[PDB]
Write a protein that binds this ligand. Structure first.
Ligand code: CLA
Ligand code: CLA
Ligand code: CLA
Ligand code: CLA
Ligand code: CLA
Ligand code: CLA
Ligand code: CLA
Ligand code: CLA
Ligand code: CLA
Ligand SMILES: CC1=C(/C=C/C(C)=C/C=C/C(C)=C/C=C/C=C(C)/C=C/C=C(C)/C=C/C2=C(C)CCCC2(C)C)C(C)(C)CCC1
Ligand code: SF4
Lengths: 31, 154, 75, 75, 119, 61, 27, 38, 731, 80
């Protein structure tokens, strides 16, 4: 049981994925 | 199982509990207080209340249930005020229909509905007493109904 | 409008007169809860007549009329 | 609604209530405002859940007409 | 703004210095001889045309639509007469042959780039 | 046909569809909807006074 | 309950993610 | 003269009938209270 | 195309923020795009179905992965009654210290899993975490397969013909035989080979199933019809589930009833069950013709059903055209049947609880019911909403010349008059009887109440053998025809399950059954009054008969002709969502206050205090929110602080709905202008100017987003209360 | 644009043009009615779609029926 993987995966999907998804979708308004 | 209510235990438990509970306020007054006489009348209206529910069916709850099958032993429970009620709003409905087919053919049907013509109103109020065999005989003439009234697209 | 208000205050003074326990309330106000309106005895609702003291029951005032009558000096 | 929900709960915690022997103090909720008004679960629980309990258990008594004008007003 | 949106400059004349109400709001000075009036959108302008015309005479009036390229337009009137009055120059567009009762059902229009009334 | 005749409609978007109505005016100058018919009851515009063509002109006797 | 099976899972849903974005920019 | 026309309108006769049948219910529930039979 | 909505240029021209919201909300309306033709629609939905099923199996592989990796599943298998089953773990960086001690169930701080998934995976026979990893990989594989098909059937050489989608004639022959019969028969291939031996102790993995038969003798002397051998040795009484002890070895015994110990259905009953349903569905698959041509042409199957009585139109002439060439009729029947299936499933997950040690965890049984009920009501409302989409954007009354649907639009005034009648009858006769009982109970008198025994449901329980009533009819009478007719087969194992009171099969009944079931029929007939109203006046009303022209969810007709707030066929969805949440509200409130009276034991607390409304608000909502609303104190907190925080949260959602539902647009359309002046005029920020222009939400959207916060607040509030309540009175 | 269509019920009573505060509607002499008039909507590029015309359209049912079409800057009526 890798007890360290949510310490990486929970923030990188919880906050930084709705940064780059805001960039991909919001610039994809104009792309 | 619906026990007959005059012998059910929790029923008479509610008898002792409500006569005693309402009786607890009755010792707050003297022998000739008006409130004390009022709670005398209220205790009378509880013993009469529980004796007049004798032939009902209170189950394990101690509360008198009803039956709506038309078993003819439960006819005073449901079906006698059922036929009674249907007579009363068949009265009301036939009065209102008969008055609208009055004011439909008058001078100005708009002013007829604000100001009810209490002559012709109280004509139809009382004349609509026998609506089964008067509404039924106006149904056999093909006149209770209508045909080819308003509708939308199809 | 003032006619409806004088009917209203004449109503409060009459419900204070005939129906209230204000005369008994004037004796011990901290024990007797103020009541004017004495509910007519129909099915059940006679239980709304709260035994608030004063020897006579009825539903309890919250409008505070008895305090304005003790202030105004109505005996 | 939140003016009177400030009034009827700060003054059931900080003003009203009774006094006992030796001038000792007793509020109705018992000082239960500043530890409980700061949240909403303290507000809804400790005010609207707890102060309702004398409106809700009011059946069979003279307070039951408020138990009818409570549900009918929710209606 | 004025560098990218169509400003509407309403030009009109009068006879006496009256006082009207702006669509932006409040009372306006209303120069008596001749006065232009920049606005923001057309309903303000023809609402001002109703504001003055239904009160009194303000004719020889029309907004010159300042589109941001620089030049003007002219709409109310175009042939010089009031629109609900009838002039013999206007060509009607926007009709069909009958009521809505003969308009086509939209399952006959489905998967086609048509209207529910052109037939 | 004539003025005063009691006329049922056969157009589905008439508000008074399959309801009789009285004829007020008929013009004989090839107007597409010449037969002005008003009614007892009232549509949602507040207005009983409408007009129709000749195909939707069905009288009673 | 183990370690490398979790990595096998995240690789297989990384491939599944590439097939999802492969479905994304064609419809 | 025209007061009886006002006493023939909709809300006034609505109160003089629902007041009356209201009195039928209340006067029929003082004389025979707790009536679940029949 | 070139703008945001890469599919319709009528919205890309709009420089406001309408292009965003309508660009999102019309992304899936494939019937109304710019140039998406008939073949290009079906070739898109056939790929997006693959994307959707890929999302289902990514979801189930998610549950397999978290139970495989963070749950306590096999620790729960060791002790099914004691240990509370864990969901996935937590990584909050917001839990300071005091919340971290409010979750410790083992080394992880995981959520208690309130979804019944360990019970289903424990009746399946997964007794490991390893099998859950192989299953989770086994559904990442399947989700990747469906995504690869979704890429595959949008590559242009493989995008199929529209006649292949109009091979409606054969989709039923393949679905009913294959998708139902073969998958169900294979599901007996899992029950017989896994769920029978792994419940009888025998751990039979993938390694040894091709060696150890589920019967000790099998299939070489068994094409002879000696089928009592397979149902020969039933597991009778003295068995604890999972173990090998106290158990027989028969495969397809139909005992009927429950386990005595785990209160679940027998897996022999289920193996025989899906085996029978498998055979009957395979028989159903051989129904219609194909390229072989032995079966039924569907055009002959509908047109021939025309009565010579002549009352029912010119028969079904046209209906086969307007199901193939239409879609929202087919989708309407699809959501209709799925919705009745979901409501049926909720009406049997509690009633005949299939899974071991359910009706023992009292929260997951209360989560599954309310789950499938709100999903059930959602799917009915969708079936009617695509009913109205069918009558607007899909209906042709010329191929339906005086057809059955045209007959339906003809007499629709009687249908709406009578749904309005029966709704008006029930709403004066639940609220009549509840305000009667509430007034009467309020005046110190529970006796003067109107209580009517619901005799008809008690009589039906007497036809299924509930002998606690004293009717003594077909199954409650042991001397009848049917009571003897299955005396050996499945009756005496089942009347133990009927006449027991602790189990949740054919519940004991007072007048709360009567009054509530009238309130539920009130909820149904009102909701179908809205839906059949705005699904048959969807096409044309006498206010405006142009409603077919403006599409489905146009906003209004303006203030003309009296005013026209919400005339569209989207008001059927819009209002029937509020009545849907009301009705499923009353259903699950009623169920939940029934089983909180069974599980606590005081059913007399229900039957005496549920026929008046302060019985509900007092005895259920005020009392049973006590462990909810104590979810965190100024003294501290516990494990239910998430459900009380979600509780207050969802009151905030449910009340932000009312900002959109009540207070409509033009307030905000003349207030966003003030904000836009305030940003255009301010310094240091008028540089930062918008590109999409700030515009208040149009009232097709406004009532939608108020509806969405109404549902999210409603459903999250009640999922907070079910789980916090039953998790507070127990565990 | 918000497509305004004016059908052949238009008996030319001109409450439509007087009711439109945008002058999308004008009257056209059309020899098919008693007034000889039938309304026209040439300038639907400025058409808001507020349906103030359809309120004041005293025909049988709405000779002038406004269909809500495109949404430009002018047709959305935004000030800025
Ligand atoms: C969904 C994922 C997510 C995650 C992982 C976090 C994580 C965190 N939040 Mg947070 N938050 C979130 C959503 C999330 N939030 C949302 C949705 C809201 C709005 C409701 C908030 C509102 C919020 C507030 C109001 C506050 C936090 C704070 C914090 C920090 C907790 C302080 C602590 O004890 O940690 C220990 C913290 C540390 C050791 C420092 C780590 C800080 C960052 C992550 C590292 C440095 C960043 C780096 C320089 C920039 C690189 C790029 C960056 C995007 C990673 C923590 C890093 C608190 C804070 O500001 O922390 C200081 C705080 O006051 N959050
Ligand atoms: C003239 C009296 C009259 C009559 C004979 C009817 C008859 C009918 N109505 Mg009804 N209705 C009436 C008045 C009347 N209505 C009034 C005044 C209203 C406005 C509140 C309604 C509102 C109404 C609705 C909303 C619905 C009906 C429906 C129906 C039908 C089913 C029966 C039912 O449940 O009634 C319903 C009864 C009520 C809602 C309450 C009764 C209304 C008043 C209180 C009593 C009427 C007495 C009348 C005022 C007396 C005036 C005349 C007198 C002074 C001379 C039935 C044909 C339903 C239908 O279409 O079913 C097919 C339906 O959905 N009605
Ligand atoms: C309009 C409705 C109505 C009707 C039909 C009646 C009818 C009746 N009342 Mg009555 N009553 C009414 C309103 C009505 N009352 C109102 C509004 C009051 C309050 C002022 C009273 C106060 C009243 C008293 C005080 C008495 C009656 C009594 C009676 C009965 C005498 C005959 C008769 C049944 C008498 C009776 O029989 O009661 C014992 C009686 O003593 N009524
Ligand atoms: C619409 C549903 C409904 C129904 C079917 C009933 C039915 C009943 N209620 Mg009732 N009630 C209701 C709603 C309803 N209630 C509501 C909503 C409230 C709250 C306001 C009440 C409050 C209430 C009270 C406070 C009481 C009742 C009582 C009663 C019972 C006798 C009524 C009565 O006065 O008879 C007597 C009236 C008559 C006999 C008059 C009929 C005579 C006719 C008109 C003469 C002509 C016929 C030819 C009866 C079972 C009474 C009772 O004892 O309960 C059992 C009672 O005390 N109800
Ligand atoms: C025998 C061959 C066969 C098989 C197995 C399938 C199978 C399938 N086809 Mg298909 N198809 C076939 C031949 C076949 N097709 C042919 C020949 C044609 C052309 C004529 C088509 C044309 C076609 C189209 C056009 C579409 C499909 C679709 C689908 C998928 C259905 C969607 C779904 O998941 O429902 C699965 C449903 C069930 C498994 C049963 C649900 C209902 C039961 C009664 C209730 C639940 C059962 C039980 C109680 C609950 C267990 C759950 C558990 C939690 C306890 C499914 C994978 C759809 C799809 O997804 O596209 C990719 C679709 O849009 N097919
Ligand atoms: C409806 C068809 C169906 C479904 C949904 C399942 C589903 C399942 N089977 Mg399976 N099975 C089926 C038919 C089916 N089976 C048939 C027909 C056979 C006979 C060949 C088997 C024989 C079988 C074995 C031998 C095992 C499974 C196992 C499993 C579980 C995990 C499978 C995995 O890791 O991937 C899973 C719940 C495994 C399991 O439950 O672990 C104990 C396992 O060991 N199955
Ligand atoms: C579609 C599901 C399915 C599949 C793929 C198999 C497959 C198999 N079964 Mg089988 N079986 C099934 C359903 C299935 N069974 C059901 C539903 C029953 C109960 C009637 C049985 C009862 C059964 C017996 C009694 C035996 C098999 C045996 C076998 C194996 C050789 C034949 C083969 C692997 C034989 C074997 O060797 O067992 C593994 C054997 O003796 N099966
Ligand atoms: C298998 C089920 C199914 C399928 C395939 C469809 C398919 C369709 N529906 Mg639909 N519908 C369904 C079920 C289904 N529906 C149900 C069950 C309901 C009742 C609730 C509806 C109600 C409904 C309406 C009212 C309409 C459709 C429409 C449509 C069509 C276009 C969809 C679209 O553009 O959405 C685009 C996609 C979105 C808008 C995204 C959905 C986001 C929603 C609004 C809220 C979800 C957000 C979530 C709650 C927030 C998360 C936060 C968390 C805290 C909860 C399409 C054919 C529309 C149509 O044909 O006319 C245009 C239409 O107007 N449907
Ligand atoms: C407390 C909330 C509440 C209540 C009681 C109702 C009740 C009703 N709605 Mg409803 N509705 C609600 C909220 C509510 N709605 C919400 C939030 C929405 C979303 C906007 C809708 C949307 C909606 C639609 C779309 C439809 C309904 C319809 C109906 C009626 C169904 C027929 C029926 O049962 O009549 C029984 C009658 C009642 C339950 C009325 C209550 C009894 C009253 C209070 C007694 C009479 C007055 C009393 C004597 C007090 C006098 C007052 C005093 C000033 C003198 C019923 C009146 C439908 C309809 O018209 O059906 C015919 C319909 O199509 N509703
Ligand atoms: C609008 C629309 C629609 C609608 C929708 C829906 C939603 C529908 C409905 C439907 C539904 C929702 C369904 C229901 C069903 C019903 C039923 C189903 C009933 C019957 C019953 C039965 C069947 C039962 C009985 C029994 C028993 C009890 C036991 C014994 C045996 C038997 C089985 C007989 C449609 C699409 C159609 C069309 C188009 C339009
Ligand atoms: S649409 Fe709005 S603007 Fe164009 S005419 Fe009708 S009302 Fe006047």
């Amino acid at each position: 049981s890798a007890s360290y993987l949510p310490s990486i995966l929970v923030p990188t999907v919880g906050l930084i994925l709705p940064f780059a998804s805001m960039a991909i979708l919001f610039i994809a308004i104009e792309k | 199982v619906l026990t007959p209510c005059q012998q059910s235990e929790a029923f008479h438990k509610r008898e002792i509990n409500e006569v005693r509970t309402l009786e607890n306020r009755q010792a707050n007054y003297e022998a000739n207080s008006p409130s004390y006489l009022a709670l005398q009348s209220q205790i009378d209206q509880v013993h009469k209340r529980f004796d007049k529910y004798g032939t009902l069916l209170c189950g394990q709850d101690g509360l008198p249930h009803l039956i709506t099958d038309g078993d003819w032993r439960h006819a005073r429970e449901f079906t006698i005020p059922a036929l009674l009620f249907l007579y009363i709003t068949g009265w009301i409905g036939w009065v209102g229909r008969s008055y609208l087919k009055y004011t439909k053919e008058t001078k100005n049907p708009t002013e007829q509905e604000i100001i009810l013509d209490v002559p012709m109103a109280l004509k139809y109020m009382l004349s609509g007493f026998l609506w089964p065999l008067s509404a039924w005989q106006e149904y056999r003439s093909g006149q209770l109904l209508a045909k080819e009234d308003e509708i939308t697209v199809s | 409008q003032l006619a409806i208000i004088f009917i209203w205050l004449s109503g409060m003074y009459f419900h204070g007169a005939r129906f209230s326990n204000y005369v008994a309330w004037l004796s011990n106000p901290t024990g007797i809860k103020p009541s004017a309106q004495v509910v007519w005895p129909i099915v059940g609702q006679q239980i709304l007549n709260a035994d608030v003291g004063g020897g006579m029951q009825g539903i309890q005032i919250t409008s505070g009329l008895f305090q304005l009558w003790r202030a105004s000096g109505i005996v | 609604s939140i003016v009177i929900f400030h009034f009827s709960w700060k003054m059931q915690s900080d003003v009203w209530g009774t006094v006992t022997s030796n001038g000792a103090i007793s509020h109705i909720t018992g000082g239960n405002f500043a530890q409980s008004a700061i949240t909403i679960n303290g507000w809804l629980r400790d005010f609207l859940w707890a102060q309702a309990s004398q409106v809700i258990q009011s059946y069979g008594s003279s307070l039951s007409a408020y138990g009818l004008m409570f549900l009918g007003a929710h209606f | 703004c004025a560098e990218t949106e169509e400003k509407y400059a309403m030009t009109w004349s009068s006879d006496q210095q009256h006082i009207f109400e702006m669509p932006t709001g409040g009372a306006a000075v209303m120069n008596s001889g001749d006065n232009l009036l920049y606005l923001a959108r057309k309903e303000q302008a023809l609402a001002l045309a109703t504001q003055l015309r239904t009160q009194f005479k303000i004719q020889d009036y029309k907004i010159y639509r300042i589109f941001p390229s620089g030049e003007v337009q002219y709409l109310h009137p175009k042939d010089g007469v009031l629109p609900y009055q009838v002039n013999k120059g206007r060509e009607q567009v926007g009709r069909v042959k009958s009521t809505i009762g003969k308009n086509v059902n939209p399952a006959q229009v489905k998967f086609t780039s048509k209207a529910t009334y052109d037939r | 046909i004539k003025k005063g005749s009691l006329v049922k409609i056969l157009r589905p978007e008439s508000f008074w569809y399959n309801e009789v109505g009285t004829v007020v005016n008929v013009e004989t100058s090839k107007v597409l909807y010449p037969v002005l018919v008003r009614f007892d009851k009232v549509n949602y515009s507040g207005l009983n006074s409408t007009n129709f063509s000749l195909d939707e002109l069905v009288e009673i006797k | 309950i183990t370690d490398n099976q979790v990595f096998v899972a995240l690789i297989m849903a990384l491939v599944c993610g590439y097939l999802a974005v492969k479905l994304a920019k064609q419809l | 003269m025209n007061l009886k026309k006002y006493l023939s309108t909709a809300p006034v006769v609505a109160t003089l009938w629902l007041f009356l049948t209201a009195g039928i219910l209340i006067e029929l529930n003082r004389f025979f209270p707790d009536s679940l039979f029949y | 195309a070139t703008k945001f909505p890469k599919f319709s240029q009528a919205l890309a021209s709009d420089p406001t923020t309408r292009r965003i919201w309508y660009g999102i909300a019309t992304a899936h309306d494939f019937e109304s795009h710019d140039g998406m033709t008939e073949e290009n629609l079906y070739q898109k939905i056939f790929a997006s179905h693959f994307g959707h099923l890929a999302i289902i199996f990514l979801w189930t592989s998610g549950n397999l992965f978290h139970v495989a990796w963070q749950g306590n599943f096999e620790q729960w298998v060791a002790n099914p009654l004691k240990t509370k089953p864990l969901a996935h773990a937590i990584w909050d960086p917001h839990f300071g210290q005091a919340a971290l001690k409010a979750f410790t169930r083992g080394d992880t701080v995981a959520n208690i899993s309130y979804s019944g998934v360990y019970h289903w995976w424990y009746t399946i026979g997964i007794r490991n975490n390893v099998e859950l990893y192989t299953g989770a990989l086994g559904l990442l594989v399947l989700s990747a397969v469906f995504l690869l098909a979704g890429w595959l059937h949008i590559q242009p050489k493989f995008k199929p013909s529209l006649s292949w989608f109009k091979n409606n004639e054969s989709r039923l022959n393949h679905h009913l035989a294959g998708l139902f019969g073969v998958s169900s028969l294979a599901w007996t291939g899992h029950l017989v080979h896994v769920a029978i031996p792994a419940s009888r102790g025998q751990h039979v993995g993938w390694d040894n199933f091709i060696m150890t038969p589920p019967h000790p003798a099998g299939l070489q002397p068994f094409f002879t019809g000696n089928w009592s051998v397979y149902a020969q040795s039933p597991d009778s009484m003295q068995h604890v589930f999972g173990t090998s002890q106290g158990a027989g070895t028969a495969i397809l015994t139909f005992l009927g009833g429950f386990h005595p110990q785990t209160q679940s259905l027998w897996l022999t009953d289920m193996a025989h069950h899906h085996l029978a349903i498998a055979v009957i569905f395979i028989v159903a698959g051989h129904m219609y013709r194909t390229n072989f041509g032995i079966g039924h042409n569907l055009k002959t199957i509908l047109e021939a059903h025309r009565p010579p009585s002549g009352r029912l139109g010119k028969g079904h002439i046209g209906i086969y055209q307007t199901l193939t060439n239409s879609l929202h009729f087919q989708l309407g029947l699809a959501l209709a049947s799925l919705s009745v299936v979901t409501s049926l499933v909720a009406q049997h997950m509690y009633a005949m609880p299939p899974y071991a040690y359910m009706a023992f965890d009292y929260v997951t049984q209360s989560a599954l019911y309310t789950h499938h009920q709100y999903i059930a009501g959602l799917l009915i409302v969708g079936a009617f909403a695509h009913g109205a989409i069918f009558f607007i954007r899909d209906y042709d009354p010329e191929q339906n010349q005086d057809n059955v649907l045209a007959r339906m639009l003809a007499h629709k005034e009687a249908v709406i008059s009578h749904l309005s009648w029966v709704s008006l009858f029930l709403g004066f006769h639940t609220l009549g009887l509840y305000v009667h009982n509430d007034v009467v109970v309020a005046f110190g008198n529970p006796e003067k109440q109107i209580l009517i025994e619901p005799i008809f449901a008690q009589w039906i329980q007497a036809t299924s053998g509930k002998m606690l009533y004293g009717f003594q009819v077909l199954l409650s009478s042991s001397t009848s025809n049917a009571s003897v007719a299955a005396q050996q087969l499945w009756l005496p194992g089942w009347l133990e399950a009927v006449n027991n009171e602790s189990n949740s099969l054919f519940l004991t009944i007072g007048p709360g059954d009567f009054l509530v079931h009238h309130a539920i029929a009130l909820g149904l007939h009102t909701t179908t009054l809205i839906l059949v109203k705005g699904a048959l006046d969807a096409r044309g009303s006498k206010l405006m008969p142009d409603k077919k022209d403006f599409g489905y969810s146009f906003p209004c007709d303006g203030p003309g002709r009296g005013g026209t707030c919400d005339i569209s066929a989207w008001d059927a969805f819009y209002l029937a969502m509020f009545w849907m949440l009301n009705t499923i509200g009353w259903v699950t409130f009623y169920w939940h206050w029934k089983h909180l009276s069974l599980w606590q034991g005081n059913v007399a607390q229900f039957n005496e205090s549920s026929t008046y409304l302060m019985g509900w608000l007092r005895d259920y909502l005020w009392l049973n929110s006590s462990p909810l609303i104590n979810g965190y104190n100024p003294y501290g907190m516990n494990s239910l602080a998430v459900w009380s925080w979600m509780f207050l949260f969802a009151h905030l959602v449910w009340a932000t709905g009312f900002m959109f539902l009540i207070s409509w647009r033009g307030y905000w359309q003349e207030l966003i202008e003030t904000l836009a002046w305030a940003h255009e005029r301010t310094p240091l920020a008028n540089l930062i100017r918008w590109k999409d222009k700030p515009v208040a939400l149009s009232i097709v959207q406004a009532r939608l987003v108020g509806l969405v916060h109404f549902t999210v607040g409603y459903i999250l509030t009640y999922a907070a209360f079910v789980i916090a309540s039953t998790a507070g009175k127990f565990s | 644009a918000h497509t305004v269509k004016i059908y052949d019920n238009c008996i030319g009573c001109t409450q439509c043009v007087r009711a439109c505060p945008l002058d999308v509607l004008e009257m056209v002499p059309w020899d098919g009615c008693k007034a000889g008039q039938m309304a026209s909507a040439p300038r639907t590029e400025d058409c808001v779609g507020c349906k103030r015309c359809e309120t004041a359209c005293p025909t049988d049912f709405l000779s002038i029926r406004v269909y809500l079409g495109g949404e430009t800057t002018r047709s959305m009526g935004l000030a800025y």
